[PDB]
């Protein structure tokens, strides 16, 4: 039939660069990175990156085109746009001097610094990422290490103090479940921290907890993306705690 | 409350089922929390501590040897450049039916 | 001979040569108590490493995100300063 043209099929259709993905979703870079963390969109590597983009370098990030197409349907995008428009309305009220209207509109923002909870709700994301409770139990190692670490950190704009208090509360609830079911198995005093190993429904769960000292936040880490991980993991640990308490027939939350 | 585990794409793509990239040199998946060994104990056994100390000692030895070798190569390169510059300056001064 | 040549958990201490992101990850800092620094009690234990940095490195190594560097200053928009018309036309 008609002769095909070069660069219209194959890897050039299979991959997108991060710039193309961000323009395709019409997002800002922080929102895009946050959404990729929350939905599990991972960087990919083509065989020949020039076939995808002629200006690509070794530091160019690639993603699957189908993964970006899937991100097009996520309901959090409208939540992002609603929060941006609400912030514009609050700015209008403050600039006109309507302090009561500004307070009333700010109550709809659901800011973490007053709620202790993430700014956006990730409940629908949890079931998509973990089809089974066994999958959630297998990701509990990373979840518990991150949350037990962040329970001992100072307040920041990325993770406010009330969110840190909620992290501590969730870790304490999980510890109480382990106590009343006698699920804790091993512990280890290393030079880095205290390792704990428990067994929940046949799954070994190993996590690392810092010694209680002043923890050092260095510029070598991306602390805001670590905060996005914290939001996702506290949303996961709340549901894990509810399921475990309901399974052993206790009222949740304690 | 809400209890999970109990045209929009209601199915995830297979590209999302693809596993992420591992940066491990063997290419296998790294655990989120690797199991610690006895050499990482706060009060370690003597054999584990001595094994870890010997490994880090030989790594430090080879690192310092490599650093001194590359420093000497840089020194020889600088001296060769200086000698060639001196030679160039001396040459310029000398020029001045089947 | 060609057939013989073709016939012949991940560890985070040894990484692949190719980078994932803007730079190849550095080698981990030394997590070891030196013999002169060895203590005999849990109270005087000197904790080693950084757990937040360890979790970030674990994320990058397992490939959930690529390694990026901090940008302390962003380039500003090129603008020109001019005086407002009312302040130019002010007279006294």
């Amino acid at each position: 039939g008609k002769a095909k043209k070069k660069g219209k099929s194959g890897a050039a259709r299979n991959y997108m660069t991060r710039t193309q993905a961000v323009k395709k979703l019409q997002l800002s870079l922080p929102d895009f990175r946050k959404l990729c963390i929350w939905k599990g969109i991972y960087p990919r590597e083509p065989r020949d990156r020039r076939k995808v983009n002629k200006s690509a370098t070794a530091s160019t990030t690639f993603y699957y085109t189908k993964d970006i197409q899937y991100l097009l349907h996520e309901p959090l995008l409208q939540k992002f746009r609603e929060q941006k428009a609400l912030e514009k309305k609050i700015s209008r009220a403050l600039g006109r001097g309507d302090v009561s209207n500004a307070a009333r509109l700010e109550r709809n923002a659901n800011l973490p610094e007053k709620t202790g909870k993430p700014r956006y709700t990730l409940n629908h994301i949890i079931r998509e990422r973990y089809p089974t409770f066994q999958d959630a139990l297998r990701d509990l190692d990373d979840c518990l290490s991150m949350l037990f670490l962040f329970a001992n950190l100072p307040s920041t704009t990325a993770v406010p103090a009330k969110m840190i208090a909620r992290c501590e509360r969730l870790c304490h609830e999980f510890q109480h479940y382990l106590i009343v079911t006698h699920s804790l198995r091993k512990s280890f005093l290393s030079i880095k921290g205290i390792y704990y190993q428990a067994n929940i429904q046949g799954e070994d769960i190993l996590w690392l907890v810092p010694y209680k000292f002043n923890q050092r936040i260095v510029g070598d880490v991306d602390f805001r993306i670590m905060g996005t991980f914290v939001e996702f993991y506290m949303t996961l640990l709340g549901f894990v705690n509810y399921r475990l308490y309901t399974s052993i027939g206790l009222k949740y939350p304690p | 409350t809400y209890d999970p585990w109990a045209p929009d794409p209601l199915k995830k793509p297979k590209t999302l089922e693809q596993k992420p990239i591992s940066l491990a040199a063997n290419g296998k998946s790294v655990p989120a929390v690797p199991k610690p060994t006895g050499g990482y104990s706060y009060n370690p056994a003597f054999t584990d501590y001595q094994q870890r100390l010997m490994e880090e000692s030989e790594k430090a030895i080879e690192a310092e040897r490599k650093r001194l070798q590359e420093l000497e190569l840089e020194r020889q390169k600088m001296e060769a450049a200086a000698r060639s510059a001196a030679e160039a300056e001396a040459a310029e001064a000398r020029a001045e039916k089947p | 001979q060609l057939a013989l040549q073709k016939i012949e958990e991940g560890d985070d201490t040894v990484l692949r040569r190719k980078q994932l992101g803007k730079f190849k990850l550095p080698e981990k800092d030394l997590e070891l108590v030196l013999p002169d620094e060895l203590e005999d009690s849990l109270r005087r234990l000197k904790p080693e490493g950084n757990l937040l940095k360890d979790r970030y490195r674990s994320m990058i190594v397992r490939g959930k995100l690529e390694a990026r560097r901090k940008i302390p200053f962003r380039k500003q928009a090129k603008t020109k300063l001019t005086e407002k018309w009312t302040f130019k036309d002010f007279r006294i």
């Binding site: - | 000692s57 030989e58 690192a63 | 002169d36």
Partner: peptide
């Protein structure tokens, strides 16, 4: 080349880098 002093030097460099990172009208 004493390995103890080499390891001490590497450790002190690492803590130095870590502390540097953590630090009219």
């Amino acid at each position: 080349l004493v390995p103890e002093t080499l390891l001490k030097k590497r450790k002190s460099q690492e803590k130095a880098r870590a502390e540097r990172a953590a630090a009219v009208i």
